[PDB]
Amino acid sequence: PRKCARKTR
Amino acid sequence: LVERLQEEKRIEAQKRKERQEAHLYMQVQIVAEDQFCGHQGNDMYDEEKVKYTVFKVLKNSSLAEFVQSLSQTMGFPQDQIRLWPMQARSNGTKRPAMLKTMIELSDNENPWTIFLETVDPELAASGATLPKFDKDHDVMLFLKMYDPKTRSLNYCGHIYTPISCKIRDLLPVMCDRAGFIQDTSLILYEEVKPNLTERIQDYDVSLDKALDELMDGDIIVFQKDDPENDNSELPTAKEYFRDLYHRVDVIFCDKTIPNDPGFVVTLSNRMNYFQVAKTVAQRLNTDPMLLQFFKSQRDGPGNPLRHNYEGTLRDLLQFFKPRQPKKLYYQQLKMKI
Ligand SMILES: [Cl-]
Ligand SMILES: [Cl-]
Ligand SMILES: [Cl-]
């Protein structure tokens, strides 16, 4: 499992 | 005069060399966890109220240089600190992010602010150390406990956990940091951004799946499920953050008392004339009718506000800049003649 690299909302 | 007139030339000489050089330098603002305690708002601290350690650093200097200057200045070993640059995001949050020239690392930002994790010097005196962090398999999270009785937030520090860990597996720690018994029933939220506080329903899934858009510096808010608080004015963290989003502190100066420092009233952006007037009256032990408010301009009272005004407090305050302290002038009218 992984973290996202950037938020988008 | 003779040697006095040389020093006035030396000062203009040194102060102009510094004016020219100042583009080569950048501010780095170091903020420390102790500044997060007590913060009642969104994200980790108030930009305005927080206290920084300030570094003047060559834009093209290296990180290792900074770290060294840092560890030696702050008094920590180089391997007992971790840097978490603060990152302003599109969604209106600023968060610690993960971590060549300093200026390129700051993404051209200046002042650059950095959350400096260190070990508590008290706990390090008894063998505590900087926990390691698998930048790929671990995630750093921030914890807040909301108390509906007092309607307050209580910072509960941070944690390092494997991303693959179940939400349920973190409950023991939240319970403990909050001073609650193990297996106390908790309601959990992701503080996403201002006015968005999403409940976490499935506790039996990994952190990757439980929070939307999982990143380091994400914030989980939790609270008891105490029945005494259904009663409360803001029963949940969700409702608390909504109240907060629409919240604004306004300063009221009596135009007739020149230089009146005024007093601060906490209002809502979605109030109307009646609501504004009535609140301010209850503070002054007077009738709303007897209050005339004046619009905002310049500095000084503007045109008089008419009591049939149909707008909102937002509308009245829409010409104030982010850092500008929100003030409105009023005055009192006579009861009889
Ligand atoms: Cl809204
Ligand atoms: Cl209201
Ligand atoms: Cl008129």
Cβ-defined contact of A1 to B90 (cutoff 8 Å)? no
Query: Strand pairing partners for B146?
Result: B153
Considering the domain architecture, whether residues B126 and B153 belong to the same structural domain is answered as no
B35 contacts chain A (CB < 8 A): no
Which of the listed residues B215, B245, B275 is the one where a domain comes to its end? B245
B167 contacts chain A (CB < 8 A): no
Contact (Cβ atoms closer than 8 angstroms) between residue B163 and residue B208? yes
Which residues form the domain of B160? 131-245
- In chain B, which ranges are E strands? 25-32, 53-58, 81-88, 94-96, 112-118, 138-147, 152-162, 186-193, 196-199, 218-224, 247-254, 263-268, 291-296, 301-304, 327-332
Alpha-carbon span B217 to B158, nearest angstrom: 9
Phi/psi region, residue B107 (left: phi>0; alpha: psi -120 to 50; beta: rest), is: left
Q: After which residues is chain A broken (C to N over 2.5 A)?
A: none
Considering the domain architecture, whether residues B188 and B139 belong to the same structural domain is answered as yes
Q: Which of B91, B206, B215 sits opposite A4 (nearest CB)?
A: B215
Structure tokens at B88: 């302003």
In sequence order, what are the residues at sequence separation of 6 or more whose Cβ sits closer than 8 angstroms to the Cβ of residue B173? Answer: B143, B159
Q: What are the φ/ψ torsions at residue B29 (nearest 5 degrees)?
A: -110, 115
Contact (Cβ atoms closer than 8 angstroms) between residue B236 and residue B226? no
Please tell me whether residue B196 adopts helix, strand or coil conformation.
strand
Structure tokens at B144: 């807040």
Which of the listed residues B130, B161, B183 is the one where a domain comes to its end? B130
Half-sphere exposure of B173 (CA within 13 A, CB side): 17
Q: H-helix or E-strand containing B237?
A: helix B237-245
Pairing of strands B138-147, B152-162: antiparallel
Q: Which of B135, B164, B215, B216 is best to mutate for the A interface (most A CBs within 10 A)?
A: B215
Inside any domain, residue B266: yes
Alpha-carbon span B191 to B207, nearest angstrom: 14
Pairing of strands B138-147, B218-224: parallel
Considering the domain architecture, whether residues B84 and B65 belong to the same structural domain is answered as yes
Sort out which chain B residues have CB atoms less than 8 A from A1's CB and list them. 163-164, 206-209
Which of the listed residues B76, B103, B130 is the one where a domain comes to its end? B130
Instruction: Count CB atoms within 10 A of the CB of residue B206.
Output: 16
Alpha-carbon span B191 to B193, nearest angstrom: 6
Cβ-defined contact of B91 to A2 (cutoff 8 Å)? no
Cβ-defined contact of B208 to A2 (cutoff 8 Å)? yes
Contact (Cβ atoms closer than 8 angstroms) between residue B260 and residue B300? no
Q: Using the 8-state DSSP alphabet, how is residue B151 labeled?
A: T
Query: Strand pairing partners for B181?
Result: none
Nearest chain B CA: its distance from A6 CA (Å):
8
Considering the domain architecture, whether residues B95 and B179 belong to the same structural domain is answered as no
Q: Exposed, middle or buried: residue B291 (CB in 10 Å: 0-12, 13-18, 19+)?
A: buried
Inside any domain, residue B7: no
Instruction: Say which CATH number the domain at B216 has.
Output: 3.10.20.90
Q: Exposed, middle or buried: residue B270 (CB in 10 Å: 0-12, 13-18, 19+)?
A: exposed
Alpha-carbon span B294 to B302, nearest angstrom: 6
Considering the domain architecture, whether residues B73 and B62 belong to the same structural domain is answered as yes
Return residues with CB closer than 5 A to ligand 2 (ion): B 268
Q: Which of B89, B208, B216 sits opposite A1 (nearest CB)?
A: B208
Inside any domain, residue B199: yes
Q: Is the peptide bond before B111 cis (omega within 30 degrees of 0)?
A: yes
Considering the domain architecture, whether residues B31 and B55 belong to the same structural domain is answered as yes
Nearest to B210 by CA among B193, B195, B188, B232: B188
Cβ-defined contact of B216 to A4 (cutoff 8 Å)? no
Nearest chain A CA: its distance from B163 CA (Å):
7
Considering the domain architecture, whether residues B116 and B167 belong to the same structural domain is answered as no
Considering the domain architecture, whether residues B212 and B180 belong to the same structural domain is answered as yes
Instruction: Count CB atoms within 10 A of the CB of residue B249.
Output: 11
Pairing of strands B301-304, B291-296: antiparallel
Cβ-defined contact of A7 to B215 (cutoff 8 Å)? yes
Q: What are the φ/ψ torsions at residue B71 (nearest 5 degrees)?
A: -65, -35
Q: What is the DSSP string of B27-84?
A: EEEEEEGGGGTT--SSSSS-TTT---EEEEEETT-BHHHHHHHHHHHHT--GGGEEEE
Q: What Å resolution does this PDB entry report? A: 2.9
Inside any domain, residue B206: yes
